[PDB]
Paper text:
We determined the crystal structure of the DH522.2 Fab in complex with a deglycosylated chimeric B.YU2 gp120 core to 2.8 Å resolution. We found that the DH522.2 HCDR3 was in an extended conformation, with its hydrophobic tip inserted into a pocket on the surface of gp120 near the junction of the inner domain, outer domain, and bridging sheet. This pocket was part of a broad hydrophobic surface underlaid by loop B and adjacent to the well-characterized Phe43 cavity. A shift in the bridging sheet represented a departure from the CD4-bound state, exposing the hydrophobic patch rather than preserving the full depth and shape of the Phe43 cavity. The loop B hydrophobic pocket, the core epitope for DH522.2, is also the binding site of NBD-556 and related CD4 mimetic compounds. The HCDR3 hydrophobic tips of both DH522.2 and the poorly neutralizing CD4-binding site antibody F105 reach into the loop B pocket, but the overall orientations of the two Fabs with respect to the gp120 core are quite distinct. Although the DH522.2 HCDR3 probed the CD4-binding site Phe43 cavity, superposition of the DH522.2 Fab-gp120 complex onto the BG505 Env SOSIP.664 trimer indicated that DH522.2 Fab would clash with a nearby gp120 subunit. A 3D reconstruction of DH522.2-bound CH505 SOSIP.664 fully glycosylated trimer by negative stain electron microscopy confirmed that DH522.2-bound Env trimers in an open conformation, a mode of binding consistent with an Env conformation between the CD4- and b12-bound states. A broader comparison of CD4-binding site antibodies showed that other bnAbs included loop D and V5 in their epitopes rather than loop B; those bnAbs also had more favorable orientations of binding trimeric Envs with much less steric occlusion than found with DH522.2. Thus, DH522.2 interacts poorly with a closed Env trimer, explaining the limited neutralization breadth of antibodies in its lineage.
Author numbering:
A (entry chain L): 3 to 6, 8 to 27, 27A, 27B, 27C, 28 to 95, 95A, 96 to 106, ...
B (entry chain H): 1 to 35, 35A, 36 to 52, 52A, 53 to 82, 82A, 82B, 82C, ...
C (entry chain G): 90 to 115, 160 to 166, 169 to 180, 187 to 201, 207 to 258, 263 to 299, 311 to 325, 343 to 358, ...
Amino acid sequence: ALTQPPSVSKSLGQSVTISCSGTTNDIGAYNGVSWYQHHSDTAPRLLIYEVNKRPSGVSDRFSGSKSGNTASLTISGLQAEDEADYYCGSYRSGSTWVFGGGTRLTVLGQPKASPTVTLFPPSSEELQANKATLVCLISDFYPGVVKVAWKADGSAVNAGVETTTPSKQSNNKYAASSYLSLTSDQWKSHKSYSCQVTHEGSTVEKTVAP
Amino acid sequence: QVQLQESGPGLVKPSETLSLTCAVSGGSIGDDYYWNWIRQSPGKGLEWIGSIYGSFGGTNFNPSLKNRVTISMDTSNNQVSLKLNSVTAADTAVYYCARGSHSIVVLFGYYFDYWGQGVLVTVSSASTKGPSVFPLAPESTAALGCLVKDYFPEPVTVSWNSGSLTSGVHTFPAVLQSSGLYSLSSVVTVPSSSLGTQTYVCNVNHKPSNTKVDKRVEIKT
Amino acid sequence: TENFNMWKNNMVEQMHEDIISLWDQSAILKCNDFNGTGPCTNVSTIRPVVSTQLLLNGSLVIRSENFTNNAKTIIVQLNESVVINCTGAGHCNLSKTQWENTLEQIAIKLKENKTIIFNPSSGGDPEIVTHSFNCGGEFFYCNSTQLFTRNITLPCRIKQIINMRCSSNITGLLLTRDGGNGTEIFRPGGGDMRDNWRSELYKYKVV
Ligand SMILES: *[C@@H]1O[C@H](CO)[C@@H](O)[C@H](O)[C@H]1NC(C)=O
Ligand SMILES: *[C@@H]1O[C@H](CO)[C@@H](O)[C@H](O)[C@H]1NC(C)=O
Ligand SMILES: *[C@@H]1O[C@H](CO)[C@@H](O)[C@H](O)[C@H]1NC(C)=O
Ligand SMILES: *[C@@H]1O[C@H](CO)[C@@H](O)[C@H](O)[C@H]1NC(C)=O
Ligand SMILES: *[C@@H]1O[C@H](CO)[C@@H](O)[C@H](O)[C@H]1NC(C)=O
Ligand SMILES: *[C@@H]1O[C@H](CO)[C@@H](O)[C@H](O)[C@H]1NC(C)=O
C-alpha cells in the first residue's frame, strides 16, 4: 500500500501537512492522487482529486501537491470539524487502485463542554420478565473522557455495570452509555439508585426510584 | 447528483459467500463511470476491492482478492453487486459502494466522488439473536426512549414515528456484554408540553434476524 | 565506458511531467546502432500522442526491462508501418493482409520454440481495453478485438474534450504477457504513458 504517518497532532488555528509516500507505479505514473476525509458514522468525503483540484465545496484551507513518488495534503486554520481520519489514494498501473494506510488527525484546543446526563428506570414490561436494566445516557461532552459511578441508596455499586467507550457525535462532541443490569428483586431491594458522571473535575448526578 | 444504498446479509458463516448489492438512484449505471466496492475493517484503513465500468461491464480487482471476488451490474434494477467467496473473520468490515469519475484515466486516474453509507457485514459462527425492545419514560422538555436489548450481530435501526420525527433523535452506540450480545438506546427529546397530545413510537429494525418492532412509549399510570 | 539505461531514464520522467502539465489545457549523448544496454559503441552528441495498445507516428525489434517478468511491459517497434484510417463517423478501416503479416512477424520474434497467441485485453479500463487515442480535439475508443485475435473494420466510440477524420502510421505496440503450460499468451497493454515516451527516448542519455 501507500505510506502515511498513522497520526499527527496540531492545534486549532494552525496548519498541518499529511504526507503520502507511494511508488513509481501510482503517484509517479499518474497525476491521480485523491484525498479523503473520513468522520465516524459518515462515508468518506472526497477532498482533493487529480493531485490538487477541489470539488465545490471543500474550502480553500485544503490543498494537495505532488513531488516525485510522494503526495501531500495541507490543511490551514484547523477547525474542530477537521478532527478526522485522512486517506490518500491513487490509480495504479495494471488497472488496480490503492489507498494509503490512513492518518488520524487530532486537533488540540477544542473548547470544553459539560455532559448532558439522562437516567432511565426499568420499564414495568422488563420487570415482568424478572429483569431490570437502568440506563444512564451521557451526551455532548468534550474532551471524550468521563468516569461513571453508580450508587444504590448511597452505597457504591461495583457489579452489574457495563459502560461504553466514548465516541464522537455528528456535532464533534462525545457520547457514551452506562447500563446497570439488575434483577427485579434487587431493584426493589433498594429505594433510590443514582448515576454519577464525572467529567473534568465536576460531577453530575441523576436519581431514579421504585 | 447521485445516491447509492448498499444492502445485504448482516451475518455470514466462515467459508460461505458474502453477497451485497448497491442500488443507484439519480443516474444510470450504464454510463461512463466506474462502480467500486471499498471496505474498512475495524481498526484498519480503507481497502479497494474492485470496480466495474458501466459502459461494458469490464472489471478490475485488488490483486490479493482476485481469486475470490466477482462484481456484476444489473442494468434493469440499476444495481451493482459484490460477491466475495470463502470468507473468514478477516472479512468482517463495513462495505462501501462508490462511484468513480474520470477525465483521462491514463494521465489522471479516477477518483471516488459519491459514496453510499456502507453496510456492516459480520463473519462469525455465533447464532443470530433478535433484541427485546423496551420503552424508556420518567423542565419544559422531556426525554423518551427505547431500550434495544441483547441482540447479535450489529447493527440495529431505530426511527421514531416512522421517520416523521427527526429533531431531537439521538441513537447511542451499543454496549457489548460479556455474553457477546449487544444493547443500545435511542433517545428523542420532545417538547414537554406536547405530551398527552402527541404520540411517540420507536421503530426498531434488526435485519439479520428479521426483527421489526414498534413500541409505544408513554408516561404510565 | 559508461552506461545507457532506458528503463531508468530520468529524461522520460521529466518529459512525462510536462506533458501532464500541458494536458491541463482544460548535455545529451545520442547513440547509434541498440536497446538501452550498458555500453554504447557509437556516440553522437517528439509527438505527445496519448494512446494505448498502439504507438502512432514514431521512430521506426522488441524491448523489455525484464522479459522473464510478466508484469513488465513489452515495447514493440516495427520495421514497416501499417496505415490506419480513422473517421469521425465512428470506425477504422485497416488492411487485413497488411495487419495479419505483422502479427506473425512479431510472433516469430516472440518465440525467442512454442505457440504464440494474441488475445483481447483482460478487462477493466475502457482506455486500455480499447485502442484509444486523441486526434485533434476528439478522442477515439475503438474495439480492437478483431485486431488482437480487403479491409478490417473497427467500431469506434468518440468523445470531444468536454471534461472540466484522420489517418495514421502505426509505429509500434505495447504488450503484456500472461505469465502463469506450453503457450505464451500476449494481450494489448498500455496505461503508463512513460512507456510511450521511452519507446522514443531509448537512444538518449544525459551526462
Ligand atoms: C527478472 O524477473 C525474474 C522474475 O520476476 C527475476 O527472477 C529476475 O531476478 C529478474 N531480473 C532482474 C531483476 O534483473
Ligand atoms: C486511407 O487513407 C489514406 C490517405 O491518407 C490512404 O492510406 C488510403 O487511401 C486509405 N487506406 C485504406 C482505406 O486502407
Ligand atoms: C472504409 O472507409 C471509408 C472512408 O474512410 C468509409 O466510407 C467506409 O464505410 C469504410 N468501410 C468500408 C467497408 O468501406
Ligand atoms: C467490442 O468492444 C466492446 C467494448 O469493450 C464490447 O462491449 C463488445 O462486445 C466488443 N465487440 C464484440 C463483437 O465482442
Ligand atoms: C507515414 O510516414 C511517412 C514517413 O515515415 C510519411 O511520409 C507518410 O505520409 C506517413 N503516412 C501517413 C498516412 O501518415
Ligand atoms: C499521425 O500523423 C498523421 C499525418 O500527419 C496525422 O493525421 C495524425 O493526426 C497523427 N496521429 C496523431 C495521433 O496525432
